TrEMBL record, chains A, B:
InterPro entries: ACP_syn_III_C, ACP_syn_III_N, Thiolase-like
Name assigned to this protein: 3-oxoacyl-ACP synthase
Organism name: Streptomyces sp. Tu 6176
GO biological-process terms attached to the record: fatty acid biosynthetic process; secondary metabolite biosynthetic process
GO molecular function per UniProt: 3-oxoacyl-[acyl-carrier-protein] synthase activity
Protein encoded by which gene: natS
Length: 338, 338
C-alpha cells in the first residue's frame, strides 16, 4: 500500500480577470468565453521558494520526519533560476537536508503525477526509506510572458505544491496511476518554430497562440482535429486507471482536472469523460488558472481541506500534457482534514 | 537481474583545441594546463536529433523491438527546443512510437544515471515490459555560449547517447547504482546571480567562471574549499557502490569518468579515488570534453567497443553534478562487442 501522507501548497494572491481586462492585460471577449474569474499571480517569489514552502507544509503535517525521506523529486514547466544551477538541490537544502538524491522530473502539467510514479516504484523496489517528497513550483512573471494571452486555452498561473508519499500511512491511499502518450501530437508545440538554436536563446518565449494558428493553417484536410486525439487519450487512460483501482464512476466523488478555460476544459476533459457538473472543481479552477504542474494537487488539497470529500470517498486526478500524454490517478480519502 | 542490452551514440566532429586557440576561442595557456586536445562540436544538429540517432543505434543493437520498450527517459542539461514543447515525445515519435510514457529527467551530468535508476525501479516494480530506453543529447552551439571559456574546469561538448536497460539479457550486468547529495554546495552555481527572474529570460547564460570567482571573493575564512566537499563525496559514493556490488578496486578494469580538464579531473575524481592511470579513460576524454550528461556512457561504449574490456571485467561509472550530487554505478561486462 502507498499513501499520501502530507500535502501542502503556496498560493499567491488571486488577480481578478476583471482587473486584467481593466489594465489591458486580457481581452474582454476572451474573458467572456473562458469563464475565468481570477488567476494566481506571484510578482516576485522564485519558483523554487514556492516549492520549498509547499514542501515544508506537506512534511510537517505528514507525521514523518526528514530521516524518512528517501528522495526529493521536483517538477516544473518554466525556468527555475540560473542556467546550470540545481533548483532541486536548493529545495533539498531548505527542506530535508539529508544526503539523499535530488532529481528533477519534467512532463508538462503531468510533472507531479510522473514524479509520484517514480517515487512509488522506488518505495516498492528500495526498502531503505519509508517516504518520498514530491514538489513543484513555477512563476510566469518573467520578461515578455503575457500570462493572459500566451495561450487561447488557458491563463498561466503561479503556485507551488507538494506531497509526501509513504508506505506506512497517510490521509489518502493511492490506488492507481497510469499514463499513455500520443507522440504524434508533439508537432503542435513547435509549429512555425525553428528547433535550433532553441527559441529562448533567441528571445522567443511562450507564444502558444501563434503556434496554434500555424497548426490551423497547416492542418491536413480530412484529419480529425487535434482535440479529438487529446480527448480520446484522456478517456482511455481514465478507463484504464479506474479498472486498475477497481472503482466505478459511481464511487468517484470529485474529478480534479486542470485549470483551463471552460471551452478547452469541456472539449478535452468534461465532455470526453461525461463528468457531472457537481463532480468538477470548475468554480475553484476558474479562480486559479493553469499552473505549471500543480493543478491536480491544488484541486485535491482544496476538495479535501474544505470538507467536500471525506473518508471512503474516491477522487480522480486527470491531466494531459504537451507531447502529448494523458495521465490519471485514483486516490481513496482515508482521513478528514483538520 | 538487470542488464544493459544496447548502447549507441551520436558523436559530432572533434574540434581541435589548437584551432580553438588559433581562432581566439580558447586561451593558449589554459589548453596547456587542461591538456585538452579537442572537443566534440555540433554546428547545427538539434540535441533531440542527436538523442534520436543514439536511440536508434541502441535499440537495434539491443535485440529488443519497439514492443519491449515500456518507457522512454530523456535527460539533458541545456535548452532542447521551443519553450513548452516536449523534446522527449519528439524522440519517442521518431524511435519507438508506441503509446508508452515519455518523461524528462534532469540531474546535471548524472542525468543518464538518474534515468537508469528510474528505469531499474520501474522494471522491478512493473512487470508490463521487459525493457526501457534512456537517452540524452545536448548542443552548446547556442547564442552567447563560449564553450571553451564558460568554465575553467572543462570544455563544453556536444553529443547524443542512449542505452536500453533490460530484465532479460544484454552485454553488461548492472550490479550497483547509487548516489548521495551535499546540497549545501548549491550556492556555488548561483553566486553573484539573481534567482528571479531566471537569468536566461534576461540574457544571462552559462557564466560558470564568473560565478566561481564570486565564490572565491565571498568564501569565509577557516572553511574547507568546495573541491574537498566534492571529492569526499565522490569517495563515499564509490565505496558504497563497490560494497553494494561486492567487488573490490582490484576487480575494476576501467573507470568511466567525466571529460574534465586534467586539474579538475585529478582534484575531484582521480586523486580522491587513487585511480591507476591505466584504468582511466583520459586519452579518450581529452578529445571529447564535457558533454551535458553523456560522458559516462560515451566512455563505457568506447572501452567496450574498442575491446579494452571484455566478459568478466568490471567497470565503474562515476560522476558529480551541480547541486551537488555524486553518483556511481558498477557493471560486469557479459558479452564482447561485435
Amino acid at each position: 500500500n502507498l499513501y499520501l501522507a502530507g500535502i501542502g501548497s503556496h498560493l499567491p494572491p488571486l488577480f481578478p480577470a476583471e482587473r486584467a481586462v481593466a489594465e489591458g492585460l486580457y481581452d474582454e471577449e476572451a474573458r467572456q468565453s473562458s469563464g475565468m474569474r481570477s488567476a494566481a499571480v506571484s510578482a516576485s517569489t522564485p519558483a523554487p521558494q514556492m516549492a520549498i514552502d509547499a514542501a515544508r507544509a506537506a512534511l510537517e503535517s505528514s507525521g514523518h520526519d526528514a530521516d524518512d525521506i528517501g528522495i526529493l523529486l521536483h517538477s516544473y514547466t518554466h525556468h527555475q533560476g540560473p542556467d546550470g544551477w540545481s533548483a532541486v538541490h536548493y529545495i533539498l537544502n531548505n527542506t530535508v537536508d539529508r544526503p539523499v538524491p535530488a532529481v528533477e522530473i519534467k512532463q508538462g502539467c503531468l510533472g507531479m503525477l510522473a514524479s509520484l510514479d517514480v517515487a512509488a516504484a522506488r518505495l516498492i523496489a528500495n526498502p531503505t526509506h519509508d517516504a518520498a517528497l514530491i514538489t513543484t513550483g513555477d512563476n510566469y512573471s518573467t520578461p515578455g510572458v503575457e500570462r493572459w494571452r500566451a495561450s487561447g486555452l488557458f491563463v498561466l498561473a503561479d503556485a507551488g505544491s507538494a506531497v509526501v508519499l509513504s508506505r506506512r500511512g497517510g490521509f489518502a491511499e493511492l490506488l492507481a496511476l497510469d499514463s499513455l502518450s500520443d507522440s504524434s501530437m508533439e508537432i503542435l508545440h513547435r509549429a512555425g518554430e525553428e528547433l535550433f538554436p532553441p527559441g529562448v536563446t533567441r528571445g522567443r518565449g511562450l507564444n502558444f497562440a501563434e503556434r496554434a494558428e500555424k497548426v490551423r493553417e497547416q492542418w491536413a484536410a480530412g484529419q480529425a482535429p487535434p482535440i479529438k486525439n487529446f480527448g480520446d487519450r484522456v478517456a482511455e487512460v481514465t478507463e484504464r486507471v479506474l479498472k486498475q483501482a477497481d472503482v466505478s464512476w459511481d464511487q468517484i466523488a470529485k474529478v480534479c482536472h486542470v485549470g483551463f478555460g471552460r471551452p478547452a476544459l469541456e472539449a478535452m476533459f468534461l465532455l470526453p469523460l461525461d463528468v457531472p457538473e457537481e463532480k468538477t472543481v470548475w468554480e475553484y479552477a476558474n479562480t486559479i488558472g493553469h499552473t505549471g504542474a500543480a493543478d491536480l494537487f491544488l484541486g485535491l488539497e482544496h476538495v479535501w481541506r474544505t470538507g467536500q470529500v471525506g473518508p471512503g470517498d474516491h477522487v480522480l486526478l486527470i491531466g494531459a500534457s504537451t507531447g502529448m500524454e494523458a495521465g490519471a490517478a485514483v486516490v481513496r480519502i482515508a482521513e478528514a482534514a483538520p
